[PDB]
Amino acid sequence: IVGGTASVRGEWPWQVTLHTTSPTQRHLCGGSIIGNQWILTAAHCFYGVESPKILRVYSGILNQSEIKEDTSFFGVQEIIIHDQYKMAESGYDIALLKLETTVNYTDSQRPISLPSKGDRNVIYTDCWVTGWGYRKLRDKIQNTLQKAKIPLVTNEECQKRYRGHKITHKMICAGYREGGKDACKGDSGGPLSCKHNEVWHLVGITSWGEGCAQRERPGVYTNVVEYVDWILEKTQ
Ligand SMILES: O=C(Cn1c2c(c(-c3cccc(Cl)c3)cc1=O)C(=O)N=C2)Nc1ccc(-c2nnn[nH]2)cc1
């Protein structure tokens, strides 16, 4: 996260850190708890992942440095990538992780609601991106989970900034005209969380952008409301 600030313990309890353990253990991507056995994340996180056997899902993490050889994690039973996914910039950047057991929900590990039936025309004004990603284009994974408030942009404005890409109704964009706050490398798969009537909804999945926090280059997110039918089909 560029231009963000440290989170506190318990602040974003649907946020997970997805680790690979091949060839060494590291943070790969963010993800969001959407059900007791379900993480919603980005398909592009699994490029070069040989199988779910090497993945670990950690919940209730504030600092990456909390994770030690005895820290409990959820195994991943299945990675469900959207069957039309080809590359982040061409859309369908969405994946479900089915966990090997159920999360018992606590103060540290809670689900986020999908965007709700009847809210397709809500204008979200309170949207936050979170993650352990770089704070600039050439940086490192951050220890402490970062947060940044970012305004949604119209698909029309977003398409005008990305004339070499197809910005579709299945994407949502967010950023400041003068840049400075954005997702960056290692935030992919994490949430764009929007609060409406004091309820959080998982509006976006961090997907791609041109650099990080550049002027007139908003971040591009998977538009979760356009995948609710796909999520319910896969999870039922
Ligand atoms: O960069 C990635 C994958 N990614 C991308 C992009 C973005 C991205 C950039 C700007 C806005 C938005 Cl909404 C997304 C995030 C993002 O996470 C991108 O535009 N193109 C790729 N993953 C990643 C993980 C980990 C290390 C890493 N590990 N150790 N050191 N670095 C290094 C990169």
UniProtKB/Swiss-Prot annotation:
Residues 1-236 form the Peptidase S1 domain. It comes from the Eukaryota. Changing residue 31 to V: In FA11D; mutant is not secreted by transfected fibroblasts; dominant-negative effect. Coiled coil: none annotated. Heparin binds at residues 160-163. The active site is at 44 (charge relay system), 93 (charge relay system), 188 (charge relay system). Disulfide bonds join 29-45, 127-194, 158-173, 184-212. Changing residue 119 to G: In FA11D; mild phenotype. Glycans are attached at residues 63, 104. This is Coagulation factor XIa light chain. The gene is F11. The chain holds residues 388 to 623 of 625 of the full protein.
